[PDB]
Design a protein around this ligand. Structure first.
Ligand SMILES: N[C@@H]1CCCC[C@H]1Nc1ccn2ncc(-c3ccc4ccccc4c3)c2n1
Length: 274
């Protein structure tokens, strides 16, 4: 088979996640993203039913890639002596929610609402498939700027969803809940709902609410921009210091602020086109 059925293009980015490149599938000019993960930097390993020892991201993406969904799909993967190479779907034109907020600042509530709903729909899909992302943030959300469809990326800090406590967090500290900071213990859904509150505030305020551990432990949110009282209410609910006091994905989606959402194409025509 060999790994030269893809044509390598510009390096999209690099970090602890490895290196991501823009690619093209030679067989049908399909756009793809190629991620190279060094074997040494793999924290949590997984195993495929056939016995192959692989990165956990491959396990979790195979559980959620039975599309369609708001999750970037794993098309293929390869093993090399000192690395693993993942072939993922690449929307085009595409923009990162982090870069989108860097350019446009605080998003209008109608846009934040459409974007936030699609994340909820995507996260619910991962949970329905027994996968937990565990690093929900603007940097891990791509926008298909023509279709106005958002898609989740980077399951490298994810895990299989479980009803017991997690005592491992390899995600963004400023997006981590107070219970992780204090006890180094959290539960999947409530820790996902905290991060969703950090995300919605980031959308509507143009920045995360907390920079340091004390601000997190305190969990008191100051609104720097004009934001509706219903939106502030949902944010503060998602950011309840006690996990049990946070909403469920159903309660978030049934909140008065989450009503009369736009469809992806309407959002792109009103807010993204031109
Ligand atoms: N969060 C960054 C946004 C801009 C490009 C580099 C990104 N860093 C990462 C980190 C880990 N992963 N894991 C998968 C991706 C990924 C997947 C598909 C992509 C499609 C188009 C553009 C970037 C893409 C990034 C990724 N990007």
């Amino acid at each position: 088979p060999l790994e030269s059925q893809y044509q390598v293009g510009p390096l999209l980015g690099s970090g602890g996640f490895g290196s991501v490149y823009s690619g093209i599938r030679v067989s049908d000019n399909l756009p793809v993203a190629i991620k190279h993960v060094e074997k040494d930097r793999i924290s949590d390993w997984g195993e495929l039913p056939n016995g192959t020892r692989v990165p956990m991201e491959v396990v979790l993406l195979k559980k959620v890639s039975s599309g369609f969904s708001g999750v970037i799909r794993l098309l293929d993967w390869f093993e090399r002596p000192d690395s693993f190479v993942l072939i993922l779907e690449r929307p085009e034109p595409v923009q990162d929610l982090f870069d989108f907020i860097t350019e446009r600042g605080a998003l209008q509530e109608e846009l934040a609402r459409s974007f936030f709903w699609q994340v909820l729909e995507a996260v619910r899909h991962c949970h329905n498939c027994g996968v937990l992302h565990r690093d929900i943030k603007d940097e891990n959300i791509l926008i298909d700027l023509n279709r106005g469809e958002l898609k989740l990326i980077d399951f490298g800090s994810g895990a299989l969803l479980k009803d017991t406590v997690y005592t491992d967090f390899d995600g963004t500290r400023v997006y981590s809940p107070p219970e992780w900071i204090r006890y180094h213990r959290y539960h999947g859904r409530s820790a996902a709902v905290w991060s969703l509150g950090i995300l919605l505030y980031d959308m509507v305020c143009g920045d995360i609410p907390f920079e340091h551990d004390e601000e997190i432990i305190r969990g008191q949110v100051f609104f720097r921009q004009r934001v509706s009282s219903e939106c502030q209410h949902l944010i503060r609910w998602c950011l309840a210091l006690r996990p049990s006091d946070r909403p469920t994905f159903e309660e978030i989606q049934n909140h008065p602020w989450m009503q009369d959402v736009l469809l992806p194409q309407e959002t792109a025509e009103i807010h993204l086109h031109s």
